[PDB]
Design a protein around this ligand. Structure first.
Ligand code: HEC
Length: 124
């Protein structure tokens, strides 16, 4: 949204160590074939913990999705900054833990990356 998608595309390289954005036709829009985390194509508005081919979600992420968490900009920028804290607050369970061990230190980068995803990773 108010973020800068081009700056986001650059900031997304950090995420490629574990993620990929491949569309429904098999085209790689961003990534290096890493499969640690789920495919981010179609994340916008997706219920957390539901990508059909990702078999590595933790129980905290599955729980949050069951609670009704779908990815929007406000939840996405809180989550990428500290995934385990975010999951504990949302879920209401303090023992919750995220499998994503990367924390994005800059808020601006979080908003830019969200604007980049609204440009390339929205599924119809
Ligand atoms: C590996 C060390 C990772 C890096 C680098 C990043 N992510 Fe990640 N991400 C990873 C895993 C293992 C998972 C599963 C989390 C779990 O607890 O189950 C995730 C998940 C996400 C999600 C949720 C998507 C969904 O399907 O619900 C998002 C929105 C996400 N990751 C975004 C993201 C971004 C933008 C990154 C770069 C700043 C990033 N991740 C890095 C592992 C790793």
């Amino acid at each position: 949204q108010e973020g800068d998608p081009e700056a986001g595309a650059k900031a997304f390289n950090q995420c490629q160590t574990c993620h990929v954005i491949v569309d429904d036709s098999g085209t790689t829009i961003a990534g290096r074939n890493a499969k640690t985390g789920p495919n981010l194509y179609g994340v916008v508005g997706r219920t957390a913990g539901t990508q059909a081919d990702f078999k590595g979600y933790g129980e905290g992420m599955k729980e949050a999705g069951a609670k009704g968490l779908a990815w929007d900009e406000e939840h996405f920028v809180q989550y990428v900054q500290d995934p385990t804290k975010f999951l504990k607050e949302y879920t209401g369970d303090a023992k919750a833990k995220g499998k994503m061990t990367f924390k994005l230190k800059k808020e601006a980068d979080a908003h830019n990356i969200w604007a980049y995803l609204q440009q390339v990773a929205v599924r119809p």
